[PDB]
Amino acid sequence: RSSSYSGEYGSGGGKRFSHSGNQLDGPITALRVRVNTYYIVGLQVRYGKVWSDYVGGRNGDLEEIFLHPGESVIQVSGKYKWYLKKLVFVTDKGRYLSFGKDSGTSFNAVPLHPNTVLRFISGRSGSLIDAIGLHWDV
Ligand SMILES: OC[C@H]1O[C@@H](O[C@@H]2[C@@H](O)[C@H](O)O[C@H](CO)[C@H]2O)[C@H](O)[C@@H](O)[C@@H]1O
Ligand SMILES: [Cl-]
Numbered sequence: 001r002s003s004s005y006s007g008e009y010g011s012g013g014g015k016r017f018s019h020s021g022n023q024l025d026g027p028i029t030a031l032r033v034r035v036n037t038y039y040i041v042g043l044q045v046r047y048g049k050v051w052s053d054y055v056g057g058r059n060g061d062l063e064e065i066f067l068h069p070g071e072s073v074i075q076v077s078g079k080y081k082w083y084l085k086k087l088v089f090v091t092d093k094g095r096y097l098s099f100g101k102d103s104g105t106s107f108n109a110v111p112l113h114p115n116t117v118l119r120f121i122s123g124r125s126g127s128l129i130d131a132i133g134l135h136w137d138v
């Protein structure tokens, strides 16, 4: 077994979500993160050529980053309180894809097993992102 799970990072508010079904669409190719003054408000992830159903709320500005062909996320750091505040996706092309404000409890997620990358995310959401979990696999 090469799969592993990092999380949950955040608190117990909101309703659980998962992108487990989405990995069949392909590898992660892009990220959308809605952000305001204090929080990560929403999240969307592009699996192959297909975006996940948007999760989170509407009170923030949408930020979007596309990954390069064959670029994978190999480390995720961030910060949270009762809600998620910052995320940094570190790639195997040496890019640090940062979203949100530098404040709160820090976390640092890396994969357990050899040669695995970020395949999908899960977590909790409502009007904001309450929590996030990272799922690693081949
Ligand atoms: O005390 C935790 C309670 O949190 C409630 O979820 C919140 C939503 O109602 C609101 O719209 O968004 C925020 C931020 O995303 C959520 O935390 C849950 O509905 C309750 O079940 C829970 O008791
Ligand atoms: Cl950058």
Ligand SMILES: [Cl-]
Binding pocket: 106, 107, 108
């Ligand atoms: Cl940390």
